[PDB]
Amino acid sequence: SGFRKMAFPSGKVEGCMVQVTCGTTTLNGLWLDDVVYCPRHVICTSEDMLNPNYEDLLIRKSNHNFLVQAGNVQLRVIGHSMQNCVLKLKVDTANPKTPKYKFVRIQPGQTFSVLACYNGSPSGVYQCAMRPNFTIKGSFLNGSCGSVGFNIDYDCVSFCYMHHMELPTGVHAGTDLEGNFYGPFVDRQTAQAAGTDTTITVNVLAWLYAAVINGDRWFLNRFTTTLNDFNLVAMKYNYEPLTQDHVDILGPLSAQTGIAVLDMCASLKELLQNGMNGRTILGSALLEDEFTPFDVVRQCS
Amino acid sequence: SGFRKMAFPSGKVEGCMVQVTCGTTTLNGLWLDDVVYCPRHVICTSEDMLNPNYEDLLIRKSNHNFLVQAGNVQLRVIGHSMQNCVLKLKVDTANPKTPKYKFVRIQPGQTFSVLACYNGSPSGVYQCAMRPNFTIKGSFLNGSCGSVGFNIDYDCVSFCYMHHMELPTGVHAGTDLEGNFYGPFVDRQTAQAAGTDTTITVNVLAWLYAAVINGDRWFLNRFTTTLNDFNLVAMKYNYEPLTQDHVDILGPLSAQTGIAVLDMCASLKELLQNGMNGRTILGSALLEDEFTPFDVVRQCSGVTF
Ligand SMILES: O=C1C[C@@H](C(=O)N2CCN(Cc3ccccc3)[C@H](c3ccccc3)C2)c2ccccc21
Ligand SMILES: O=C1C[C@@H](C(=O)N2CCN(Cc3ccccc3)[C@H](c3ccccc3)C2)c2ccccc21
């Protein structure tokens, strides 16, 4: 019993983190096989960051200008190449600790573990969700760039996120491992603002299922509702529309608890209209939306 | 910026987790050097567990009856031993992945990372606190016994917790690595009273400093208070009394934010008397006591291991 925000064990990713230094810029790189992946803004200087032309900088650089260090050992850089907002440094030695891995692009709502890193060393691990507005509410300081987010299935590490920047808002923007930004952000020191965020409805519901499993049942009510009636209420309270895909995804949890999805949706509606009343669910006085249906099942299995 | 419940990187510990099997019972063990540590209830049967005579049960066992599987290879057991509520299996081979490590007994109020494991394989990691009443509020299922809690300082892993049981209440109890229970608990399948819990006051204050550091300042007040006055409020709301030691531990955070401890205490008092008021502090509608002053600095300093 119990429910906690739980990250994947970070051992496999730890063995891939390196430090990448170019001129005076240092950040974190991800060393898989014979390739080192990192944010392209490592090739920049301060002055360039307000209006950088990355095409020119990469040609003005050579293999030897890139210092790659795995722990205390220097990797030798064979070649360098740019893909979107990520630089790929070919190195002379394959990473002996390289796990089975995939690169994946996650959708808003999906969760992952972040291993926050400085100078190629790990500081800590926490769990995050990709918000609908395509930001993440992380914990990152100067030098955290190149830190990565991931999921682990058995032995396979699916990398989904590399950290690039903090917005003036204090939220966090970054790319997939192909170097494409999540959301509309760019790697410049410009205005760029994140859109108004929304609550991930399917996740909240999963959380309510998790509460029921753990003996929190007070919010359960005798009402039922319809997907349409419920979406009307979701819209009012800035909640993502619930789809039939969502309802299907909640089937296993519905089955386990014997509470039909639309009945749980009626509980939720009531919680949105009446609030918490000063009660708590699973130790929280707010509705939590950073656990997927998969996370709730995983955690109960 | 931002502030999250951050666990330590769990690599060093992952390589120490093994499966221990004895008869039909399987659980997790911790393999350091040439010794494997697990809960002694590994020797028990579901019958025995209401009133186990551990000495007698252990006698019926020989070290050949203890199967330790690291990943997929079996280790050979030379000698077995019971220490308090832990069993120490002497094994053939020193663990090649043994980190620099210590065994420590943490205090109520201190935090640690838990690596939840099943069948000697790690499932996830989360940060929690040793409650004043010596319980933890974890996430643990059948098979999670022998999962460990730890802190890391640079290269050194300080093991402080091994998981033994879920109480009927649904909270978790366990031992240090010498097998001594935190709290009044025993490894028997009996209902057992956890005492009344308290909020860890020093930690809430540390969290308030963390909030100010991240731009959440709304709770900051024009008032101030006294240690005694504040402590009368603390006792009303089942908060731990604040001592001068706690004030001193908060000194660095006080200096960074330029906000005196007793001023922050006045803030806290007001939050206790008037509530949150539908607002949030660092994304929570409750006062969080699961961050020490050392954890706040760690996260805001960005220390690595
Ligand atoms: O989460 C973090 C990441 C980090 C951070 O935001 N940095 C780091 C530096 N870079 C600039 C740079 C590149 C080369 C040389 C000199 C400066 C990033 C950047 C990337 C793209 C557009 C604008 C800025 C911005 C940061 C700083 C303070 C607080 C929290 C966070
Ligand atoms: O967090 C968990 C840990 C786990 C759990 O509680 N177990 C596991 C078995 N053991 C007994 C056993 C030993 C050998 C053979 C048969 C039974 C523990 C125990 C230890 C000491 C006193 C009483 C019970 C109790 C558990 C089960 C369901 C839900 C959540 C949790």
How would you characterize the overall build of this protein?
It is classed as viral protein. The entry lists the keywords 3C-like proteinase, cysteine protease, complex, inhibitor, viral protein. The assembly is dimeric. The entry is titled "SARS-CoV-2 Main Protease in complex with (3R)-3-[(3R)-4-benzyl-3-phenyl-piperidine-1-carbonyl]indan-1-one". Two copies of one chain form a homodimer. Chain A has 301 residues and is an alpha+beta fold. Chain A folds into three domains: 1-14 and 100-197, Trypsin-like serine proteases (Thrombin, subunit H), CATH 2.40.10.10; 15-99, Thrombin, subunit H (Beta Barrel); 198-301, main proteinase (3clpro) structure, domain 3 (Orthogonal Bundle), CATH 1.10.1840.10. Chain A is built from eight helices and 13 strands. Chain A has a seven-stranded antiparallel sheet, with no helix packed on it. In chain A, a hairpin with a 2-residue loop joins β1 and β2. In chain A, α3 packs parallel to α6 and α3 (201-213) packs across α7. The longest helix of chain A is centred in the C-terminal third of the chain and has 14 residues, at 261-274. Bound molecules: ligand A1IT1 (2 copies). One ligand A1IT1 binds at residues 25, 41, 44-46, 49, 140-142, 144-145, 164-166, 172, 187-189 of chain B.
Please write out the topology.
The structure is a homodimer.
Chain A: H1 11-14, E1 17-22, E2 25-32, E3 35-39, H2 54-59, E4 66-70, E5 73-75, E6 77-83, E7 86-91, E8 100-103, E9 111-118, E10 121-129, E11 148-153, E12 156-166, E13 172-175, H3 201-213, H4 227-236, H5 244-249, H6 251-257, H7 261-274, H8 293-299
Parallel strand pairs in A: 8-12
Antiparallel strand pairs in A: 1-2, 1-4, 2-3, 3-7, 4-5, 6-7, 9-10, 9-11, 11-12, 12-13
PDB class: viral protein
Keywords: 3C-like proteinase, inhibitor
Assembly: dimeric
